[PDB]
């Protein structure tokens, strides 16, 4: 769907928060370039948490509607719960 | 086992002094597996023939001898579940036994 027609919630649900964090910290573990300057922490999960808090994760979420359509929500663009 | 009929599993009133009320497994064998009381003893069986010859000589009648005319007022004797005869005087035969 186009950017005008977005009917899903602007809040990043707990499942999206869990899976985005997991799949981004996995990328950090495979030596993907970090999007946020770190202060010496070495754990990829904490690195991914910091990126999520700073809203810099280079990932977008495809929300499949029941009819078959989908919406592309950028992680930076929707509200994080915590 | 694993049956929803709890009636067999329940502690029956006739378990007094012959089956331990407390002792039973807590699993799917509650009340089905039961131990034995302390002084509870299980009979081992013997021949009823001496009891039969003792019975037939006081005042009782075998089935073949009497007619059912006098069978209603008297009492029916069972030995190991088989109807042996008929006696006019239940008392003083109970005392004799």
């Amino acid at each position: 769907q186009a950017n005008q027609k977005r009917i899903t919630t602007p809040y990043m649900t707990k499942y999206e928060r869990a899976r985005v964090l997991g799949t981004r910290a996995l990328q950090i573990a495979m030596c993907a370039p970090v999007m946020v300057e770190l202060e010496g922490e070495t754990d990829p999960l904490l690195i991914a948490m910091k990126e999520l808090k700073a809203r810099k994760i280079p990932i977008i979420i495809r929300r499949y509607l029941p009819d078959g359509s989908y919406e592309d929500w950028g992680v930076d663009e929707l509200i994080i719960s915590d | 086992r694993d049956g929803k009929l709890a009636k067999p599993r329940q502690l029956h009133n006739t378990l007094w002094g012959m089956v331990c009320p407390a002792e039973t497994p807590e699993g799917h064998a509650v009340g089905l597996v039961k131990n034995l009381a302390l002084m509870a003893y299980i009979s081992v069986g013997s021949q009823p023939s001496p009891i039969l010859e003792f019975l037939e000589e006081w005042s009782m009648e075998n089935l073949e001898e009497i007619s059912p005319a006098a069978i209603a007022d008297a009492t029916k004797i069972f030995v190991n579940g088989c109807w042996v005869g008929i006696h006019k005087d239940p008392e003083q035969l109970m005392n004799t036994l």
Partner: protein, 101 residues
């Protein structure tokens, strides 16, 4: 007990406490009473677990879609909003409607 004895001691009432101890009749009656609960504890599981599994296998694919509606595995609509309000069950409270009565 004498025949046809409907008195409290003859039918299971225990006038003694756990301190004074139970007279042997009362001990046997209490054992027989607790045996019922012990049997029920074992018997109830084979029905309750089966009920739980049967409930789960009938609803295991019912979920809230991104349309905010509730649909089963074949996209048949069960509720237009979850709980007919669209709200999570873990973030609600008990409240009182002041304007009522």
């Amino acid at each position: 007990f004498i025949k046809d004895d409907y008195g409290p001691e003859s039918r299971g009432f225990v006038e003694n406490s756990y301190l004074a101890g139970l007279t042997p009749t009362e001990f046997f009656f209490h054992a027989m009473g607790g045996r019922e609960g012990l049997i029920d504890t074992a018997v109830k599981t084979a029905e309750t677990g089966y009920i739980q599994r049967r409930l789960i296998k009938s609803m295991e694919s019912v979920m809230v879609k991104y349309d905010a509606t509730v649909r089963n595995s074949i996209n048949q609509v069960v509720q237009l909003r979850y709980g007919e309000d669209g709200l999570a069950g873990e973030s609600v409270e008990f409240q009182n409607l002041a304007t009522l009565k």
